[PDB]
Ligand binder design. Structure first.
Ligand SMILES: [Cl-]
Ligand SMILES: [Cl-]
Length: 131
């Protein structure tokens, strides 16, 4: 029987080994076939009928393609300080500026309010206003 667009998408990805920055798995689990993985996220599919699942929710095929192409939300860890005495280990969303997450932010005196976090910032100390 001729592949549906959903089945064709799965089969093509299973042969190529990935879809953009998602890795093909193919592992059979209680949640269905582990289809695509990116960081801590796994898309599954069940059969009869072909149904996609992410984070305990059924997602349609059109909505899956949108979600797969969204930029991955990545994080780094930094220290924040209000005083250069007391440092707090803080997770940073790499999709947002320092300013969006912390308010006005300096790194060794340089204003990084408008800057996006980068890997090279991991473990650095940022000076912020008190909350
Ligand atoms: Cl799930
Ligand atoms: Cl930037």
């Amino acid at each position: 029987s001729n592949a549906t667009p959903e089945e064709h998408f799965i089969e093509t990805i299973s042969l190529a080994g990935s879809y953009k920055d998602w890795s093909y798995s193919g592992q059979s689990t209680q949640l269905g076939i582990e289809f695509l993985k990116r960081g801590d996220k796994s898309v599954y599919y069940t059969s009869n009928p072909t149904t996609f699942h992410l984070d305990g929710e059924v997602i349609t095929f059109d909505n899956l393609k949108t979600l797969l192409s969204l930029r991955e939300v990545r994080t780094i860890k930094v220290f924040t300080t209000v005083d250069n005495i007391n440092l707090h280990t803080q997770v940073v969303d790499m999709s947002m500026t320092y300013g969006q997450q912390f308010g006005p932010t300096y790194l060794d005196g340089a204003d990084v309010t408008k800057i996006k976090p980068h890997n090279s910032h991991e473990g650095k100390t940022f000076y912020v206003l008190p909350n």
